[PDB]
Amino acid sequence: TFFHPKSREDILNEEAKIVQALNNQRELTIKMHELKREEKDYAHSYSPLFSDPVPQGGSIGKAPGSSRE
Amino acid sequence: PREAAAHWVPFEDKANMPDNVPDVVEVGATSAPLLSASYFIGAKCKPYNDDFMLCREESQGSGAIDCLKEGRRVTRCAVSVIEDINKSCLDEFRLHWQCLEQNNHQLSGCRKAEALLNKCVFTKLNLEKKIPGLRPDEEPVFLKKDPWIKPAVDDFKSVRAYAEAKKNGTL
C-alpha cells in the first residue's frame, strides 16, 4: 500500500517527450551544420553597401575601350 | 602605356593597310600649330570625336578595328579645319605657333597673337574659343586683362601686329 509508483502510461509519455526533444535537437544540429557551409551572398560575405564586385579602377587617364563585360 | 626601359630599338613596318580599309589623309601638323588649332578643332569635331570614343567604349576591346570609319571622320574634320586656317588665316596662325615655340608651349606667352587669331577665325570661319566646365561667375584665363603670369619677353612680331590692329580697329 505504501508503493505508489508512477503508472506505465505516464512513464512512457514522459520518456517519449524527452526523446522528442532529443530528436528535435538532433534535427536542429543537422540544420545548422547545413546552413553553415552553404554559399552566401557577396553582400552578406564581403560588403553590404558596395555590393558590386566589379572593380572600377583608376580615373586619371581613363581610356575609352578599357571596360569589358 | 609605360615608356621603354633599359634598351629599345625602333622598328618600322613597310607593309600597307589592308584593302578592305579605305585610305585616309593624315593631319600633317606638328606640335605647335596643332596646339593653336586645338580649340577650333574641338568646336567643329565634337560629335565626330565623341562618336569615335563612344564606339571605342562600346566595342570593349576591338576599338582599333571597329572604329576606323569614325576615326577617318575625325581626321578629315581636323584636316578641314587646318585647311581652312591655311587658306584664310595663315599669318596670325603662324604668329601664334612660332610664339608657342619660343616659349615652352605655354599659351600664357602668346595672348597677343591668340587674340588676333581668335578674332579672325570667329569672323571668317565662325568658330570661337570656349573653355567649358566653368560657371558664369568664372573668368576664362585667356580673356583676363592683367594676368599674374606673363611672358619673360613678349613676342616682337605679335606686339607690332597687336599695336597695328589696335590702330586700325581690327580688335
| A64 Cα to chain B: minimum distance (Å) | 5
Element holding A31 (H helix, E strand):
helix A8-35
B61 with A65: Cβ contact below 8 A:
yes
B53 with A64: Cβ contact below 8 A:
yes
Other CB atoms within 10 A of residue B118 CB: 22
Nearest CA in chain B to A62: B57
Nearest CA in chain A to B53: A64
Q: Nearest-5° angle of CA B57, CA B31, CA B115? A: 100
CA-based diameter of chain A, in Å? 100
Domain boundaries in chain A? 1-69
With contacts defined as CB-CB under 8 Å, which chain B residues touch A58?
none
| B70 Cα to chain A: minimum distance (Å) | 14
Other CB atoms within 10 A of residue B97 CB: 21
| A67 Cα to chain B: minimum distance (Å) | 6
Which residues fall within 8 angstroms of residue B98, CB to CB, at 6 or more apart?
Answer: B32, B155, B157
What resolution does the deposited structure have, in angstroms?
Answer: 2.7
Taking the C-alpha atoms of residue B32 and residue B102, their distance in angstroms, rounded to an integer, is 10
Which residues fall within 8 angstroms of residue B36, CB to CB, at 6 or more apart?
Answer: B93, B96, B97, B100, B114, B117
Select from B3, B56, B74 the residue whose CB has the most chain A CBs within 10 Å, as the one to mutate to test that interface. Answer: B56
> Which position has the grid cell 560629335?
B47
Nearest partner of B119 among B69, B161, B77, judged by Cα:
B161
Domain boundaries in chain B? 1-171
Taking the C-alpha atoms of residue B79 and residue B48, their distance in angstroms, rounded to an integer, is 13
Burial code of B45-80, b = ≥16 C-beta within 10 A, e = fewer? beebbebbbebbbebeeebeeebbebbbbbbebbbe
Gaps in chain A (C to N over 2.5 angstroms) fall after none
B57 with A68: Cβ contact below 8 A:
no
With contacts defined as CB-CB under 8 Å, which chain A residues touch B56?
64-65
